[PDB]
Amino acid sequence: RMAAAVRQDLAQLMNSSGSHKDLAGKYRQILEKAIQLSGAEQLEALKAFVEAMVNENVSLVISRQLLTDFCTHLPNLPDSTAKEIYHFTLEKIQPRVISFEEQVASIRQHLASIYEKEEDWRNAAQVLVGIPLETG
Amino acid sequence: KKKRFEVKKWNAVALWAWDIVVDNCAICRNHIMDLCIECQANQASATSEECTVAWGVCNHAFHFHCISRWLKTRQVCPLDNREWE
Amino acid sequence: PSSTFAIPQELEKSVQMFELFYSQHFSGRKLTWLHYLCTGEVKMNYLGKPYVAMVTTYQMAVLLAFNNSETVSY
Ligand SMILES: [Zn+2]
Ligand SMILES: [Zn+2]
Ligand SMILES: [Zn+2]
Numbered sequence: 564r565m566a567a568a569v570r571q572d573l574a575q576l577m578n579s580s581g582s583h584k585d586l587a588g589k590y591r592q593i594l595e596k597a598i599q600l601s602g603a604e605q606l607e608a609l610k611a612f613v614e615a616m617v618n619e620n621v622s623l624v625i626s627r628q629l630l631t632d633f634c635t636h637l638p639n640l641p642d643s644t645a646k647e648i649y650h651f652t653l654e655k656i657q658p659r660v661i662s663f664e665e666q667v668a669s670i671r672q673h674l675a676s677i678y679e680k681e682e683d684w685r686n687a688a689q690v691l692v693g694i695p696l697e698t699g
Numbered sequence: 700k701k702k703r704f705e706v707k708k709w710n711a712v713a714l715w716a717w718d719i720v721v722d723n724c725a726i727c728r729n730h731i732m733d734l735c736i737e738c739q740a741n742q743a744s745a746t747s748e749e750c751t752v753a754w755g756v757c758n759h760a761f762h763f764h765c766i767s768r769w770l771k772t773r774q775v776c777p778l779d780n781r782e783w784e
Numbered sequence: 785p786s787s788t789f790a791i792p793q794e795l796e797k798s799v800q801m802f803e804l805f806y807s808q809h810f811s812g813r814k815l816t817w818l819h820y821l822c823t824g825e826v827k828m829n830y831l832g833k834p835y836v837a838m839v840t841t842y843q844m845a846v847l848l849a850f851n852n853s854e855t856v857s858y
Contacts, residue, residue, distance in 0.1 A: 580852070619792065659796050700830025704851050707825035707838075711798050713806070714813020 566607040573615040623662045649674040721752035724761045726769035738762035757781030786819040
């Protein structure tokens with residue numbers, strides 16, 4: 564329940580009127596907190612962070628770089644559940660996809676490189692072809 | 700609730716060009732807007748934005764013997780890499 | 785002329801479901817973005833004002849730029 568720790572850390576930043584950069588750093592501290600978690604706890608931390616990022620109280624111009632930062636640790640991180648959570652990720656990028664577009668481009672660079680090097684050539688080019696890159 | 704500027708009714712955006720390039724059947728520029736010389740002479744159903752316009756098996760929507768013409772310049776037709784049609 | 789904008793979730797649904805109907809209809813031109821159809825949406829938001837003062841397109845966009853932050857510099 565560092566799940567819960569970050570959960571209410573962010574439920575009370577929901578209750579904050581902090582500024583652009585300031586509140587950004589608040590969420591960034593809570594991010595890097597969840598980053599430095601370890602395992603299944605860190606996994607549901609991912610879960611709950613992005614469940615945080617869903618709102619408009621979380622701005623789009625917030626979640627831009629907040630989840631950019633959520634992301635740029637992931638190249639460093641294990642591959643199995645990285646595929647897993649890129650899947651769930653993209654499934655939940657579904658709503659305002661253009662809010663996520665470039666970030667998705669990179670997610671799927673990573674993810675398709677996984678399938679490529681996992682030789683899951685099907686799901687590789689398949690789930691590459693999910694994207695409207697320039698057609699977004 | 701007296702201001703946070705919540706959602707009124709709103710009005711939106713559209714087009715209609717086409718989901719193709721198409722670039723006016725580049726082999727000449729009697730356009731794809733235009734029934735060109737050779738294909739005003741041939742003239743299938745062809746109009747002021749598709750005289751021939753599509754992502755076809757060619758996708759090089761090139762006029763009848765204008766497509767044949769730039770297949771004349773190369774009988775391997777790499778125009779979009781289908782043979783003149 | 786058009787640029788970045790909030791585009792709340794229903795605006796997503798508008799472009800996308802229109803593209804449902806419309807990619808069904810036509811593709812290549814689609815639900816592009818065009819500000820000058822925009823006007824002001826500032827109404828019974830939660831206002832001591834009983835006021836609905838619609839504004840022009842980028843009137844709308846830039847007032848959008850200044851909503852919650854009760855003051856905002858350059
Ligand atoms: Zn002509
Ligand atoms: Zn043509
Ligand atoms: Zn001919």
